[PDB]
Amino acid sequence: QYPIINFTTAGATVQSYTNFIRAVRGRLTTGADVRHEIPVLPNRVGLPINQRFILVELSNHELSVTLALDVTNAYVVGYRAGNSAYFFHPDNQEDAEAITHLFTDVQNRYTFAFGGNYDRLEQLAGNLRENIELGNGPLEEAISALYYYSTGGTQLPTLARSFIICIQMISEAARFQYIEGEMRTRIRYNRRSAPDPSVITLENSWGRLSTAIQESNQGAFASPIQLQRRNGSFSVYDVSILIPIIALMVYRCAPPP
Amino acid sequence: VQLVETGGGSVQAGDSLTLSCAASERIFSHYAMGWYRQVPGKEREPVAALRLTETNYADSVEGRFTISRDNAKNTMYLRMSSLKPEDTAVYYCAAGSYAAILYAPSYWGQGTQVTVS
């Protein structure tokens, strides 16, 4: 069986959400491949299927949905509600075979024709990340929408919107202490707002940051990476600035020795 | 991949001890490190932490404990001054990520007994 991490938006405080994200990170990496104080997610190639996925159980009103997160990139691939399961379109064959292992005891399995990346989901949702709100409200409503998709109520522009909400508040909060902290400040003051460009460019730059950090000359980037702040305005040439920012990376190369 | 400790023992209240932790080369350049402690029957609590450089001390030990590092010898140190009976525990050297050194570390040493009576 796969590991399960529990969370509910009913009474969610900065403490409970924080401990939830930290448990998610704990199950994403063993901690055995840390480079520059940043853990590297395990390599996809040699990974047995029995270690490929993580399960996140969300609850609220008390409807529960189980998201499936890919261990190799902390990203959501599908979800389970009741006796139904819905998956994102795989981009090769081995991940599809791995998907068949996720929710084996459900009656109905349906794979969306579209992938899980931000582009396609944005196009389905009618909005893009820059205008969709994040917060405990958006998450609590997202859980209900996901549950009632299998019931037959929710439509696609709402389903995919709830998808990008869950992905940002869970997957990207796990990837970055920065985004986790911003969600903590939204939960603390009951706020609900669109993620400012700092968040969005960090989301778009996760893979490139992984590559540059693992490929650096003892921390020094070979090429500078461009990021943004909150107003939208910089280059990073080193891993030092990113240590309290990024919490998880993809396996790009082998450790140098 | 290895964390070796030494420096425990039995002292009286008000005395001091200094723990040392020889670390592997890979751990030393890519990991945050720290010191935890545990009494039989209770949970492991973090005591000190060296990150980024950045220090993090538990409220119980701030002002009395000082964590330090020697880059040229692959050894981390914890100086424990003005010891109290509350400090009696098994102390563990630890190494983890930047975020998860203050909670849920990655690597551990054997654990050295510190007795304050």
Residue numbers in the entry:
A (entry chain A): 5 to 65, 67 to 238, 240 to 263
B (entry chain B): 2 to 53, 56 to 120
Q: What did the published study say regarding this structure?
A:
The fourth VHH, V9F6, recognizes an epitope adjacent to but not overlapping the ribosomal P-stalk binding pocket. The epitope of V9F6 principally involves the C-terminal portion of α-helix A (residues 26, 29–30), loop–b (residues 34–37), β-strand b (residues 38–39), loop b–c (residues 40–41), β-strand c (residue 43), loop E–F (residue 182), and two residues in helix 310c (residues 249–250) as well as residues immediately proximal to helix 310c (residues 253, 261–262). V9F6 established a total of 11 hydrogen bonds between CDR1, CDR2, and CDR3 residues in V9F6 with RTA. Some of the key interactions included hydrogen bonding between the amide proton in CDR1 Arg-27 with the main-chain carbonyl oxygen of Ala-36 in RTA, the amide proton in CDR2 Leu-53 with Glu-41 in RTA, the amide proton in CDR3 Tyr-101 with the main-chain carbonyl oxygen of Glu-41 in RTA, and Tyr-110 with the main-chain carbonyl oxygen of Ala-36 in RTA. V9F6 does not contact the P-stalk protein binding site on RTA. In fact, the closest V9F6 residue Tyr-101 is 6.0 Å away from the N-terminal amine nitrogen atom of the superpositioned P-stalk peptide bound to RTA. Overall, the focal point of V9F6’s interaction with RTA centers on β-strands b and c, loop b and c, and α-helix A with the rest of the antibody angling away from V9B2, V9E1, and V9F9 when bound to RTA. V9F6 has an Sc score of 0.73. In contrast, V9F6 had no effect on the ability of RTA to interact with BSA–P2C11, even when the antibody was in molar excess. In contrast, Vero cells transfected with V9F6 remained as sensitive to ricin as control cells.
A byproduct of castor beans (Ricinus communis), ricin toxin consists of two equal sized subunits, ricin toxin A subunit (RTA) and ricin toxin B subunit (RTB), that associate through electrostatic and covalent interactions. RTA catalyzes the hydrolysis of the N-glycosidic bond of a single adenine base within the sarcin–ricin loop (SRL) of the 28S rRNA, a conserved hairpin-like structure that interacts with eukaryotic elongation factors (EFs) 1 and 2, during ribosome translocation. According to the two-step model, RTA first associates with the C terminus of the acidic P-stalk proteins (RPLP1 and RPLP2; “P1” and “P2”) of the 60S ribosome before being guided to the SRL. In this study, we report the identification and characterization of 11 alpaca-derived single-domain antibodies (VHHs) that recognize distinct epitopes on the hydrophobic surface of RTA normally occluded by RTB.
